[model samples]
Target: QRTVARDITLLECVGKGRYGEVWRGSWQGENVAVKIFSSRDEKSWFRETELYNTVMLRHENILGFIASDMTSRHSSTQLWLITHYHEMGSLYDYLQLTTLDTVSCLRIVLSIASGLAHLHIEIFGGKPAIAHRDLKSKNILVKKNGQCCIADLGLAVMHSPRVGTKRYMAPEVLDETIQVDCFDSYKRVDIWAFGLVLWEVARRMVSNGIVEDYKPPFYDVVPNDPSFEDMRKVVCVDQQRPNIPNRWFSDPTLTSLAKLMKECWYQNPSARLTALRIKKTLTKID
Candidate 1:
């Protein structure tokens, strides 16, 4: 039986939110991330644990899971999900302080495409087709190699799916027009969110010796912590998409990326490119 030790010593608090706190922990002399789940968010913990336990989900671009455990703390139960620790933090934090060159920018986005493709495709007698409902910068972690790995698989669906983050929800989801019974609907939703992430990364790529400041998708149209109705008006009602800067036209790479992301944001969900197609396109890009 593959078993993880239960005596991990937490070193520092790496992240904190409504879900609970993520701490950098030491287990048998190696670093691990300990995600302590709040009582309200125990379902997410159970969901992630179920997936990890059933699937051989190892991939270069997927976050490595170590173990999940429940322990008593002062007569109360404490839920913990442990995984590999990435010191570089999330892609959201990295983009805020770093500017990327053409190669680095392609590397980042391509790696993400690779990860998403891996999740969407089913391997015979191995893994199921998974959809990451919540695909966003904050859920991606930057590695030391300049690559990124998809994290927070709590909202993932196996041929199966969630309510994604409000800001990243697709038009179909926001408009209540999605086919709940069809798995393709979930993948299309992920593609829509992926396009927004592409836009976010592309904007920070230095072009013409200039780079735009980091901004979230629909940053101009929606307020911080935008509500569902706020997103619906901008996405489904108005059909607004992220802007492509004029400077992108001057660079061939950015130009290609702009075109690629546009296809992902098509109002018609079926018209959106598949993750495999997106991965192939990204592989061919300069």
Candidate 2:
């Protein structure tokens, strides 16, 4: 089994991630994102590579996986996962420098929901069900076309479950009360984070000539780099949620999005709407 591999020249470091550094690299005269991880994060690289190798995991709303390679140099091991580069950066960065109208806002979020639905549902003779345990604004990449492609599969859960970030953890996840053996529990956690993301997007949506400044969910309640205990106090004990402006009702789109997001954030995991349901709801919004 011989495979022909091409050399990639890393141009610059774009972002330093938790697992590794991201670089803008060129392969065959085309720009691609290079996620290079050290031995410390070898498992993450391996998991993502394995997940990407699955058939039918590809989707327009999901980041395109191109190649994965491992090399050793001077007693150090380097793992690389190359993906299609998006010049628009991440949704978090995009939202900071931009504001969205009703149409643009719906397009971004609906694309996200569509991607989530695809990951959450399983097709026979295809890929297994995937749960993006760490679904957040920062983990989602925005394309030039204004659509979102879910990225950062290092923390994703499939047949093997893993944990997510503290800030996006659901109430059940925060208090160690989630049914660990249940696959649906992981999907529920993703829904909780999805609700928060919708809140983030809706905040920037201009409606009735008014829009709130961009702020992450629970911005006031927790300090930067909040710990698990910090989130547990707010989400489980306090049962707090992101602030929803009263003016959202003035616009039909935001009004409908508010309702859908609320369904995603219900403390009762079973009561939370599934990704497919959320997609259907978002599709109906005008």
Candidate 3:
């Protein structure tokens, strides 16, 4: 019935999507980003605010919410997802720009592992453990001190994971063969993606992005935009693999990356390691 009254003129258009455009604007006294859901999609099936207006959200790694913005003229309200801003846009942008030391890399990766562990484990009185179906470097935000906070919660689904980014999604998920009955299967999927992310971080310092440059894990020999069929060809049918470079054995970070990744890529989902296990393994890094 009540909301953030809006007379705020749009300032900078930050992003556009099927639902609407996100604008960085000043309202009342503070700066905020407003996502005005499209009137066109309102009639069809898209309801951005309905999905976001939920009350079950709290975590260190998530983006903060001020309030939803709406005016008398507009029928549907704009969902305002607010949080501190970074001069650097995303992990994707940050990696391309700056190189990370070993300590810095471990800290950043550990933070994300903690965050995902929280989402998967439901720590600290938090309810309804959540999973970011779309887990990628672009979705993670790096801070001034090197800690990372996971961002973009809108696309995340609870009970039934909607189809997601093919690059990071687990093989079982792509093939629709995974038993979505319990949390273990879903959580292992996150671990698989996180392993590759660790590889991405490790390479930034050593090979200067050469080992996996512009190549997502299992993609060099595997097909790009790999369908379940294509994935099955190498990963399933033929039992080929992603080359874990031998050079990794020389560097501590890369060595850890190779080991952790192998543990997660196990064909049987039950044999895969847990998120808590992933966090423990990360600590062993220098």
Candidate 4:
């Protein structure tokens, strides 16, 4: 079978990611962000296609996927999902280098909150909405305008059998101590991670750069990749809680952020702050 093949040559790589590499690609002389899926998770690679094929998502801040296509090689196909390139890269990259001002911090936080709200809020069909199980700084991209969007959906769940990064995951998620499988748990996990991201952003203020900002949550319980067994031991059996930095309480901005973070980390899930509300809180941070 001979046909015109859609191909994008990797001009320059912006970042190498866990699931894939983010490349600066040019097709038809137009710039795009090309996320090449890793060979390890072929199914996960297809999931993004399933999402783009099914769900209709649009937001000014959400990483808008312009196009996606597969390259067939007989044995396996390389999947490339293209979007308008954001040269500013990710929030993690930005955080590593620069200290933000007060207004700048709010903009970054607010943009992410808005993007999360879109994911959690249901539209038609009464579908329970999607949750980004792996909500992390590396997955959040920033723009030169200071706006941001949530990227990566490999770990996302529509109904959430289970989702989220261990360190960034909510306590309830780590243990499955919560009874029902609901959207709230997923939302709260996002919120918990959101709070942590907020904490990360707030701490990057040169002067107030999180003394504790670089620290991962649940560090007290275990190291970077705390397993389910370890988390269950701490969250389920021991009933341990993540310790909040006391210093966060002193700064008005940090205080508000801490409250929001804790609110999202609620064990019951129902008691957690809604993504819509989290946006409200972040927008009004004093």
Using lDDT as the measure, the top candidate is 1
The TM-score of candidate 3 is 0.78
Name the lDDT value of residue 53 in candidate 2: 73
What is candidate 4's lDDT per residue for 182-257, written digit by digit as tens? 6566677777678778777766653355554454455666766777777767766776655656666666876776
What TM-score would candidate 2 get against the native?
A: 0.95
lDDT of 1 by residue, 194-216 (tens): 99999999999998799999999
**TM-score of every model versus the real structure:** 0.96, 0.95, 0.78, 0.85
Q: After superposition, how far is residue 30 of candidate 1 from its true place, in Å?
A: 0.7
| Model 4 regions more than 4 Å off | 1-5, 125-128, 159-163, 178-181, 206-213, 219-221, 233-247
Weakest 10 consecutive residues of candidate 3 by summed lDDT: 41-50
Report the C-alpha displacement of residue 101, candidate 2, in angstroms.
0.7
lDDT score, candidate 1? 0.93
**Best-first order by lDDT:** 1, 2, 4, 3
- Candidate 2 lDDT: 0.89
Error of 2 at 10 (Å): 0.9
Every candidate's lDDT: 0.93, 0.89, 0.66, 0.74
In candidate 3, what are the lDDT values of residues 1-286, reduced to their tens digit? 8885656656788668665666777767776666565654342112224444544456566554555444455564434444445445567767776776678878888888888887776535344556666677877877777788776655544542235566676767766788877766777777777777776676665543444344456657656676656665666566554676766777778788678878877877787878788889989877
Clash count of each predicted structure = 0, 0, 0, 3
Candidate 2, 69-176: lDDT as tens digits: 888789887899889999899999988979999889999999999999998888875778998888999889999898999997887778623468788999998999
Off by over 4 Å in 3: 1-10, 14-23, 27-56, 68-80, 123-125, 155-162, 207-214, 222-228, 239-241
Q: Candidate 3, overall lDDT?
A: 0.66
